Amino acid sequence: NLPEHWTDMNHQLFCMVQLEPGQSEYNTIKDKFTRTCSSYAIEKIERIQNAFLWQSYQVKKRQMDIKNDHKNNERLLFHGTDADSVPYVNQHGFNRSCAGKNAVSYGKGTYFAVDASYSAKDTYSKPDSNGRKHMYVVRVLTGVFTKGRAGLVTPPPKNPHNPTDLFDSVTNNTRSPKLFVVFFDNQAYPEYLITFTA
Amino acid sequence: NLPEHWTDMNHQLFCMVQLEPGQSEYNTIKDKFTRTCSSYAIEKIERIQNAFLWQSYQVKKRQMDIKNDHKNNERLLFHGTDADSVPYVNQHGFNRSCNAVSYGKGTYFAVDASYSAKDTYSKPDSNGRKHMYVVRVLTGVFTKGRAGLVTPPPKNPHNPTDLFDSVTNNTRSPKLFVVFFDNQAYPEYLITFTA
Ligand SMILES: NC(=O)c1ccc(OCC2CCCCC2)cc1
Structure with a gap:
């Protein structure tokens, strides 16, 4: 069930795995980051192995792949957060109830x-007492999306006469998406987890 | 692995199935309700067959059975709600953001x-119709709740991420449980009933 190139956690449910520069797995994340954050420097990149999440x-x-009848439902996105949130996110993922x-x-x-570059703003990846900034790279089920609105506590319905048949996520701009919002665990x-500094 | 007692859905993933009165399943669910709501009038009971949920x-x-190293993590509880929320719950289940x-x-x-039967929860619609779910809840290991919690408390402040599974009003004699995750x-x- 768990991906075959994960480290053997021998019965453990959770591990952070430090990647090596020069491995394709490290370099692809570094390249994705440096595309818009070339003024910052990466300290380390850890693969998050969380069996339950x-x-x-x-x-x-x-379920979304079945429902939408295509496999274009997942995007690889960034999430900047504070040092105090990292232990919770590593173990329990992203909780909308805690969202700024x-x-x-x-x-x-x-x-x-x-x-x-968006997640790299101090507003999100707040520098800790040692000037370390923290950014996740996240598989997100964006699925079918529409432009969001501040009042939403769930994605809006696709059709106002069928209120329970929802968009999967919302964005700032459907033609040029730069952020996505999800409303479910x-x-x-x-x-x-990218640890980086100025 | 859909439950044995579900009825065939013709290759679909969601169905509300009205139960036959006087058959074992209807009688079992009715008895759980009449233990405390014998003064009410049951219009119907529907089995929610939601494969994804x-x-x-x-x-x-x-996961909770593995974490807690036992199978005593589930309780059958009640949830009263308004008619306008029923379609959402049937399809998407419970949402703390609502x-x-x-x-x-x-x-x-x-x-x-009887607690879920209060009009504040199971709000009567025009015709006096009230709605209450019978819910399988993963209460797991629980502690007393308090105002402002967004997740259950940690079991020990020394491991802040190892949480209780749910909270209650009273650990010795619980009358309600609160869960914080989808x-x-x-x-x-779903029980449809009147006073
Ligand atoms: N929807 C329901 O059925 C339901 C709703 C609320 C509920 O307890 C809430 C109160 C909060 C103040 C102290 C006593 C308990 C139990 C069930």
Whole structure:
């Protein structure tokens, strides 16, 4: 059930795995980050191996793939957060109940950025006492999306006469999406933690 | 792995199935309600067959059974709600983001149907129709709740991420439980009733 290239956790449910520079797995994340954050420097990249979060996320992905009748439902996005939140996110993922109000709100949910530069703002990846900034790389089930609105506590219906048949996520702009908001647990898998500095 | 007692859905993933009165299943669910709501009038009882919600719930159950190293994590509880919320709950289950929240910002479930039968929860529509779910809830290991909780407290302040599974008003003699995560509750039956 767990991915075959994960480290053997021998009966453990959770591990953070430090990646090596020069491995394709490290370099792809570094390249994705540096595309918009070349003024910052990466300290380390850790692969998050969380068996329970993976299981629940992969069930939601299978369900969305069935429902939407295509496999274009997942995006790899960024999430900047404070040092105090990292232990919780590593273990329990992204909790909308703990989410900050975004400077431009498209709904009351968890925000994920297309560009690492957005998540790199001190407002999100708050520097800790040692000047370390923290950004997740996240598999997000964006699915079918529409432009959000500040009042949303769930994605809006696709059709106002069928209020329970929802968009999967919302965005700031459907033609040029730069942020996505999700409103349900296990719709986002924290896959890598980037620790970085100025 | 859909439950044996579900009825065939012709390759669909969601069905509300009206129960036959006088058959074992209807009688069992009716008895749980009449223990405390014998003065009410039951119009019908529906089995909620929601394959996706069941799947996500059973994954959480298996995880909680592993974490707690036992299978005593599930309780059958009641949830009263308004008619306008019923379609949402049938399809999507319980959402903490959707009354007093004295034990935390989660979804509330009653031990007694009589508590859920209060008009504040099971709001009567035009014709006096009231709605109450019978819910499978992963209460697991619980502690006393308090106002402002967004998740259950930690079991020990020394491991802040190892949480209680739910909170209650009273650990010795609980009358309500609050859960704070999606897919910790499966709406199993919908009772439509009047006072
Ligand atoms: N929807 C329901 O059925 C339900 C709703 C609320 C509930 O307890 C809430 C109160 C909060 C103040 C102290 C006593 C308990 C139990 C069940």
